[PDB]
Write a protein that binds this ligand. Structure first.
Ligand code: FAD
Ligand code: MG
Ligand code: NA
Length: 279
Protein backbone atom coordinates (compact mmCIF):
# COMPACT_ATOMS: atom_id res chain seq x y z
CA UNK A 1 0.00 0.00 0.00
CA UNK A 2 1.41 3.41 -1.07
CA UNK A 3 0.55 6.96 0.07
CA UNK A 4 0.56 10.05 -2.12
CA UNK A 5 0.57 13.66 -0.94
CA UNK A 6 -1.56 15.17 -3.69
CA UNK A 7 -2.39 18.73 -4.65
CA UNK A 8 -6.02 19.79 -5.01
CA UNK A 9 -6.64 20.86 -8.61
CA UNK A 10 -10.25 21.82 -7.94
CA UNK A 11 -13.12 21.05 -5.60
CA UNK A 12 -16.28 22.42 -7.31
CA UNK A 13 -19.91 21.60 -6.53
CA UNK A 14 -21.51 19.29 -9.07
CA UNK A 15 -24.80 19.15 -7.17
CA UNK A 16 -26.28 20.78 -4.12
CA UNK A 17 -24.62 18.33 -1.80
CA UNK A 18 -21.84 16.80 -3.92
CA UNK A 19 -18.36 18.18 -4.69
CA UNK A 20 -15.96 16.78 -7.28
CA UNK A 21 -12.54 16.69 -5.68
CA UNK A 22 -9.83 16.54 -8.33
CA UNK A 23 -6.36 15.57 -7.09
CA UNK A 24 -3.04 15.75 -8.94
CA UNK A 25 -0.68 12.86 -8.17
CA UNK A 26 2.96 13.92 -7.58
CA UNK A 27 5.30 13.70 -10.60
CA UNK A 28 2.40 12.82 -12.84
CA UNK A 29 2.24 9.24 -11.61
CA UNK A 30 -0.95 7.21 -11.40
CA UNK A 31 -2.55 5.12 -8.72
CA UNK A 32 -2.69 1.52 -10.10
CA UNK A 33 -6.36 1.01 -9.39
CA UNK A 34 -9.22 -0.95 -10.90
CA UNK A 35 -12.51 0.66 -11.85
CA UNK A 36 -14.92 0.47 -8.97
CA UNK A 37 -12.08 0.71 -6.50
CA UNK A 38 -11.34 3.28 -3.84
CA UNK A 39 -8.62 5.17 -2.03
CA UNK A 40 -8.52 6.35 1.55
CA UNK A 41 -8.13 10.01 2.45
CA UNK A 42 -6.54 10.83 5.78
CA UNK A 43 -7.04 14.13 7.56
CA UNK A 44 -5.00 15.65 10.38
CA UNK A 45 -6.54 17.29 13.38
CA UNK A 46 -8.37 20.40 12.22
CA UNK A 47 -11.35 22.75 12.63
CA UNK A 48 -13.53 23.89 9.69
CA UNK A 49 -16.60 26.13 9.37
CA UNK A 50 -19.35 25.43 6.81
CA UNK A 51 -19.63 29.20 6.44
CA UNK A 52 -16.20 29.09 4.72
CA UNK A 53 -17.21 26.56 2.08
CA UNK A 54 -17.33 27.71 -1.56
CA UNK A 55 -20.91 26.85 -2.58
CA UNK A 56 -22.08 28.56 -5.81
CA UNK A 57 -25.31 30.54 -5.74
CA UNK A 58 -26.84 27.98 -8.18
CA UNK A 59 -26.65 25.31 -5.45
CA UNK A 60 -27.15 27.45 -2.36
CA UNK A 61 -30.96 27.29 -2.14
CA UNK A 62 -31.19 24.31 0.25
CA UNK A 63 -28.19 25.56 2.18
CA UNK A 64 -30.02 28.81 2.93
CA UNK A 65 -33.35 27.06 3.43
CA UNK A 66 -32.04 24.76 6.18
CA UNK A 67 -29.33 27.14 7.50
CA UNK A 68 -26.62 24.60 6.73
CA UNK A 69 -23.90 27.21 6.93
CA UNK A 70 -24.38 27.14 10.72
CA UNK A 71 -22.22 24.08 11.10
CA UNK A 72 -18.68 23.68 12.27
CA UNK A 73 -16.55 20.58 12.63
CA UNK A 74 -13.72 20.15 15.13
CA UNK A 75 -11.60 17.03 14.77
CA UNK A 76 -9.04 16.46 17.56
CA UNK A 77 -7.19 13.39 16.15
CA UNK A 78 -6.41 12.04 12.66
CA UNK A 79 -9.23 10.24 10.82
CA UNK A 80 -9.42 8.22 7.65
CA UNK A 81 -12.24 7.33 5.23
CA UNK A 82 -12.71 5.60 1.86
CA UNK A 83 -13.78 7.41 -1.37
CA UNK A 84 -14.34 5.82 -4.79
CA UNK A 85 -12.49 6.79 -7.97
CA UNK A 86 -14.67 8.51 -10.56
CA UNK A 87 -11.89 8.43 -13.09
CA UNK A 88 -11.01 5.21 -14.91
CA UNK A 89 -7.47 3.78 -14.86
CA UNK A 90 -6.22 5.43 -18.11
CA UNK A 91 -7.22 8.86 -16.86
CA UNK A 92 -3.62 9.11 -15.66
CA UNK A 93 -2.00 11.37 -13.10
CA UNK A 94 -5.20 12.29 -11.24
CA UNK A 95 -7.75 10.99 -8.79
CA UNK A 96 -11.29 12.28 -9.23
CA UNK A 97 -13.75 11.83 -6.36
CA UNK A 98 -17.43 12.66 -5.80
CA UNK A 99 -17.93 13.51 -2.13
CA UNK A 100 -21.38 13.98 -0.58
CA UNK A 101 -21.38 16.39 2.34
CA UNK A 102 -22.70 14.39 5.32
CA UNK A 103 -24.60 17.15 7.20
CA UNK A 104 -26.40 16.61 10.50
CA UNK A 105 -29.78 15.07 9.65
CA UNK A 106 -32.55 17.70 9.58
CA UNK A 107 -34.42 15.73 12.28
CA UNK A 108 -31.22 15.74 14.40
CA UNK A 109 -29.71 19.13 13.70
CA UNK A 110 -27.39 19.62 16.67
CA UNK A 111 -25.27 16.44 16.28
CA UNK A 112 -21.74 16.85 14.87
CA UNK A 113 -21.43 17.25 11.09
CA UNK A 114 -19.74 14.44 9.20
CA UNK A 115 -16.06 14.57 10.02
CA UNK A 116 -14.23 13.62 6.84
CA UNK A 117 -16.69 15.03 4.32
CA UNK A 118 -16.73 18.44 6.12
CA UNK A 119 -12.91 18.36 5.92
CA UNK A 120 -12.97 17.56 2.19
CA UNK A 121 -15.50 20.29 1.51
CA UNK A 122 -13.14 22.80 3.17
CA UNK A 123 -10.37 22.04 0.64
CA UNK A 124 -9.57 24.56 -2.07
CA UNK A 125 -7.31 24.54 -5.11
CA UNK A 126 -3.68 24.37 -3.97
CA UNK A 127 -4.37 22.53 -0.71
CA UNK A 128 -2.63 19.21 -0.05
CA UNK A 129 -4.61 15.98 0.38
CA UNK A 130 -3.01 12.68 1.48
CA UNK A 131 -4.42 9.53 -0.12
CA UNK A 132 -3.48 5.88 0.16
CA UNK A 133 -4.35 2.75 -1.67
CA UNK A 134 -5.62 1.57 -3.97
CA UNK A 135 -8.22 -0.81 -2.67
CA UNK A 136 -11.37 -2.34 -3.99
CA UNK A 137 -13.92 -5.08 -4.35
CA UNK A 138 -16.67 -3.56 -6.57
CA UNK A 139 -15.17 -4.90 -9.78
CA UNK A 140 -16.93 -5.72 -13.00
CA UNK A 141 -17.47 -9.36 -13.87
CA UNK A 142 -15.56 -10.69 -16.89
CA UNK A 143 -18.45 -12.03 -18.99
CA UNK A 144 -20.36 -10.96 -22.09
CA UNK A 145 -23.62 -10.40 -20.21
CA UNK A 146 -25.64 -7.23 -20.56
CA UNK A 147 -24.73 -4.70 -17.84
CA UNK A 148 -27.24 -2.40 -16.13
CA UNK A 149 -25.66 0.35 -14.06
CA UNK A 150 -27.89 2.13 -11.52
CA UNK A 151 -26.67 5.18 -9.64
CA UNK A 152 -27.69 7.94 -7.29
CA UNK A 153 -25.91 10.71 -5.49
CA UNK A 154 -22.17 10.26 -5.09
CA UNK A 155 -22.67 6.72 -6.51
CA UNK A 156 -21.98 8.46 -9.77
CA UNK A 157 -18.24 8.04 -9.03
CA UNK A 158 -17.83 4.24 -9.38
CA UNK A 159 -20.43 4.14 -12.16
CA UNK A 160 -18.43 6.64 -14.22
CA UNK A 161 -15.27 4.68 -13.54
CA UNK A 162 -16.86 1.39 -14.56
CA UNK A 163 -18.57 2.64 -17.70
CA UNK A 164 -15.53 4.49 -19.03
CA UNK A 165 -13.33 1.48 -18.22
CA UNK A 166 -15.62 -0.81 -20.26
CA UNK A 167 -15.88 1.48 -23.27
CA UNK A 168 -12.45 3.10 -23.42
CA UNK A 169 -9.98 0.64 -21.96
CA UNK A 170 -11.66 -2.72 -22.57
CA UNK A 171 -13.37 -1.57 -25.82
CA UNK A 172 -16.33 -3.69 -24.77
CA UNK A 173 -19.24 -4.37 -27.09
CA UNK A 174 -21.44 -5.65 -24.24
CA UNK A 175 -24.87 -4.11 -24.09
CA UNK A 176 -24.74 -1.47 -21.37
CA UNK A 177 -27.07 1.10 -19.90
CA UNK A 178 -26.85 3.56 -17.07
CA UNK A 179 -29.83 4.81 -15.03
CA UNK A 180 -29.19 7.70 -12.68
CA UNK A 181 -31.78 9.16 -10.27
CA UNK A 182 -31.55 12.71 -8.94
CA UNK A 183 -33.92 15.24 -7.46
CA UNK A 184 -33.81 18.00 -10.12
CA UNK A 185 -31.79 19.07 -13.13
CA UNK A 186 -29.18 21.02 -11.14
CA UNK A 187 -28.29 17.76 -9.36
CA UNK A 188 -27.15 16.16 -12.61
CA UNK A 189 -23.50 16.13 -13.65
CA UNK A 190 -21.12 14.34 -16.06
CA UNK A 191 -23.84 14.93 -18.65
CA UNK A 192 -21.34 15.82 -21.42
CA UNK A 193 -19.31 12.74 -20.53
CA UNK A 194 -22.15 10.24 -20.80
CA UNK A 195 -23.87 11.95 -23.76
CA UNK A 196 -20.55 11.72 -25.51
CA UNK A 197 -20.15 8.02 -24.80
CA UNK A 198 -23.70 7.30 -25.88
CA UNK A 199 -23.31 9.13 -29.15
CA UNK A 200 -20.05 7.30 -29.99
CA UNK A 201 -21.02 3.81 -28.72
CA UNK A 202 -24.18 2.24 -30.05
CA UNK A 203 -23.99 -0.45 -27.29
CA UNK A 204 -24.34 2.22 -24.53
CA UNK A 205 -27.32 4.36 -23.57
CA UNK A 206 -28.06 6.33 -20.44
CA UNK A 207 -31.07 7.91 -18.78
CA UNK A 208 -31.67 10.35 -15.97
CA UNK A 209 -34.84 10.47 -13.83
CA UNK A 210 -35.75 13.49 -11.72
CA UNK A 211 -37.93 12.90 -8.68
CA UNK A 212 -38.79 16.57 -8.16
CA UNK A 213 -38.05 18.62 -11.31
CA UNK A 214 -38.14 22.34 -10.67
CA UNK A 215 -40.08 24.89 -12.75
CA UNK A 216 -36.78 26.30 -14.05
CA UNK A 217 -35.75 22.87 -15.34
CA UNK A 218 -38.30 22.79 -18.21
CA UNK A 219 -37.91 19.06 -17.81
CA UNK A 220 -39.50 16.74 -20.33
CA UNK A 221 -37.50 13.60 -19.45
CA UNK A 222 -38.30 10.76 -17.07
CA UNK A 223 -39.65 11.66 -13.66
CA UNK A 224 -39.98 9.67 -10.51
CA UNK A 225 -37.64 7.33 -8.67
CA UNK A 226 -35.07 5.45 -10.67
CA UNK A 227 -36.25 1.95 -9.73
CA UNK A 228 -39.69 2.74 -11.11
CA UNK A 229 -38.28 4.37 -14.25
CA UNK A 230 -35.90 1.48 -14.96
CA UNK A 231 -38.71 -1.03 -14.45
CA UNK A 232 -41.40 0.75 -16.47
CA UNK A 233 -39.21 1.82 -19.40
CA UNK A 234 -36.90 -1.16 -19.77
CA UNK A 235 -37.00 -4.15 -17.42
CA UNK A 236 -40.74 -4.84 -17.48
CA UNK A 237 -40.56 -5.78 -21.16
CA UNK A 238 -37.09 -7.28 -21.02
CA UNK A 239 -37.14 -10.90 -22.18
CA UNK A 240 -34.66 -12.11 -19.54
CA UNK A 241 -33.75 -9.54 -16.86
CA UNK A 242 -32.35 -12.33 -14.68
CA UNK A 243 -29.50 -12.79 -17.18
CA UNK A 244 -28.19 -9.23 -16.83
CA UNK A 245 -25.54 -8.06 -14.38
CA UNK A 246 -26.71 -5.17 -12.19
CA UNK A 247 -24.19 -2.78 -10.67
CA UNK A 248 -25.68 -0.33 -8.24
CA UNK A 249 -24.52 2.47 -6.01
CA UNK A 250 -26.72 5.10 -4.46
CA UNK A 251 -28.11 6.42 -1.23
CA UNK A 252 -29.62 3.86 1.16
CA UNK A 253 -33.25 4.39 0.14
CA UNK A 254 -32.34 3.95 -3.53
CA UNK A 255 -30.24 0.84 -2.90
CA UNK A 256 -33.13 -0.76 -1.01
CA UNK A 257 -35.79 0.15 -3.54
CA UNK A 258 -33.72 -0.98 -6.52
CA UNK A 259 -32.68 -4.30 -4.98
CA UNK A 260 -36.25 -5.07 -3.92
CA UNK A 261 -37.44 -4.28 -7.46
CA UNK A 262 -34.80 -6.51 -9.02
CA UNK A 263 -35.55 -9.41 -6.72
CA UNK A 264 -39.28 -9.19 -7.41
CA UNK A 265 -38.33 -9.55 -11.07
CA UNK A 266 -36.57 -12.76 -10.14
CA UNK A 267 -32.99 -11.55 -10.44
CA UNK A 268 -30.71 -13.60 -8.21
CA UNK A 269 -28.31 -12.01 -5.75
CA UNK A 270 -25.27 -13.32 -7.61
CA UNK A 271 -26.21 -10.90 -10.42
CA UNK A 272 -26.69 -7.87 -8.16
CA UNK A 273 -23.45 -6.14 -7.18
CA UNK A 274 -23.91 -3.33 -4.66
CA UNK A 275 -21.24 -0.83 -3.70
CA UNK A 276 -22.49 0.12 -0.21
CA UNK A 277 -21.14 3.46 1.00
CA UNK A 278 -22.58 2.63 4.41
CA UNK A 279 -24.95 5.60 4.70
C1 FAD B 1 -15.58 1.46 0.18
C2 FAD B 1 -16.28 2.82 0.39
C3 FAD B 1 -16.33 3.74 -0.64
C4 FAD B 1 -16.96 4.97 -0.41
N1 FAD B 1 -16.98 5.91 -1.39
C5 FAD B 1 -17.64 7.07 -1.21
C6 FAD B 1 -17.64 8.08 -2.20
O1 FAD B 1 -17.13 7.92 -3.34
N2 FAD B 1 -18.26 9.27 -1.98
C7 FAD B 1 -18.83 9.52 -0.77
O2 FAD B 1 -19.45 10.56 -0.59
N3 FAD B 1 -18.82 8.63 0.21
C8 FAD B 1 -18.20 7.42 0.03
N4 FAD B 1 -18.18 6.51 1.07
C9 FAD B 1 -18.69 6.88 2.39
C10 FAD B 1 -17.50 7.70 3.11
O3 FAD B 1 -16.35 6.81 3.42
C11 FAD B 1 -17.84 8.32 4.45
O4 FAD B 1 -18.53 7.30 5.18
C12 FAD B 1 -18.76 9.49 4.28
O5 FAD B 1 -18.07 10.48 3.57
C13 FAD B 1 -19.25 9.98 5.64
O6 FAD B 1 -18.18 10.20 6.52
P1 FAD B 1 -17.95 11.46 7.40
O7 FAD B 1 -16.70 11.29 8.09
O8 FAD B 1 -18.22 12.72 6.59
O9 FAD B 1 -19.23 11.41 8.41
P2 FAD B 1 -19.22 10.82 9.93
O10 FAD B 1 -18.41 11.57 10.95
O11 FAD B 1 -18.91 9.34 9.83
O12 FAD B 1 -20.79 10.99 10.24
C14 FAD B 1 -21.79 10.37 9.47
C15 FAD B 1 -23.13 11.07 9.75
O13 FAD B 1 -23.55 10.82 11.10
C16 FAD B 1 -23.94 12.05 11.83
N5 FAD B 1 -23.61 12.09 13.29
C17 FAD B 1 -22.51 12.50 13.91
N6 FAD B 1 -22.58 12.39 15.28
C18 FAD B 1 -23.80 11.86 15.57
C19 FAD B 1 -24.59 11.46 16.80
N7 FAD B 1 -24.10 11.59 18.07
N8 FAD B 1 -25.81 10.95 16.57
C20 FAD B 1 -26.31 10.81 15.32
N9 FAD B 1 -25.65 11.16 14.20
C21 FAD B 1 -24.42 11.66 14.30
C22 FAD B 1 -23.22 13.14 11.01
O14 FAD B 1 -23.81 14.45 10.98
C23 FAD B 1 -23.12 12.59 9.60
O15 FAD B 1 -24.30 12.88 8.86
C24 FAD B 1 -17.54 5.27 0.85
C25 FAD B 1 -17.53 4.32 1.85
C26 FAD B 1 -16.91 3.10 1.64
C27 FAD B 1 -16.84 2.06 2.73
MG1 MG C 1 -25.04 19.91 -11.46
NA1 NA D 1 -25.67 5.02 -27.87
Amino acid sequence: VKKWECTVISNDNKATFIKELKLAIPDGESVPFRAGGYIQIEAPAHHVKYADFDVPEKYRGDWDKFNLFRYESKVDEPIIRAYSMANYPEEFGIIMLNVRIATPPPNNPNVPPGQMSSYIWSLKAGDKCTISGPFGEFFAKDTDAEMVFIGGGAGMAPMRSHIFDQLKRLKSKRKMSYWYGARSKREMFYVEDFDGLAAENDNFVWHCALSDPQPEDNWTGYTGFIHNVLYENYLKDHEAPEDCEYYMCGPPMMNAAVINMLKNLGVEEENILLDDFGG
